[PDB]
Input
Amino acid sequence: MDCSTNISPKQGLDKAKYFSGKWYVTHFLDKDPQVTDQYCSSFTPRESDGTVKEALYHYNANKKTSFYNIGEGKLESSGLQYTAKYKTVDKKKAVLKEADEKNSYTLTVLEADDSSALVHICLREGSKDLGDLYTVLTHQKDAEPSAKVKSAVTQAGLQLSQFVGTKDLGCQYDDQFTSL
Ligand code: HEM
Output
């Protein structure tokens, strides 16, 4: 599998709209899933002087367990786009497995407004592309994505109906973890 190629950040995006609040994934489009378990996700991205740091939460909807990461990377000159290396952590943010030089994800912000966002994520290990995901984001669980973000999905060449809606997965979130 190869990550989607026609991906660059929307120029003109306000970083104050993206690096704010927390995000919950309402809809995801996974090209070629790594495993067949389905996940819910929430995360809290912040930026300072070109360096992004984000607390990341995954809930496995099949097994009903959850895992935690902290990503860190630098913003590209293109706009709201960054490649992050990542640590695994426990629910209290104690570090377990350190970040390395071969595992990374590249996140590209396709749209972002006061309530909603559309991002693309390419997860890699070494020379291998492992995950390719588009995610529609909102600031509260089960909030409706804005018309502007729905337009962005259609502008990305995609069909929103072909995404998996997470509402039906029975997602559980750890909002203590994603605070800060
Ligand atoms: C609902 C949306 C999402 C789904 C369905 C999803 C799905 C997945 C899956 C299936 C894996 C492999 C897990 C396993 O090995 O069992 C994974 C790993 C990972 N994802 Fe997500 N993901 C989502 C959102 C995100 C977002 C928004 C980010 C970053 C902001 C992200 C970053 C990562 C990272 C860093 C890993 C590797 C974690 C590790 O191995 O320690 N994912 N994702």
Remarks:
- Helices lie at 15-18, 147-155.
- The pocket of protoporphyrin IX containing FE is lined by residues 25, 28, 30, 33-35, 39-41, 43, 56, 58, 69, 86, 88, 105, 107, 121, 123, 131, 133, 135, 166 (CB under 6 Å).
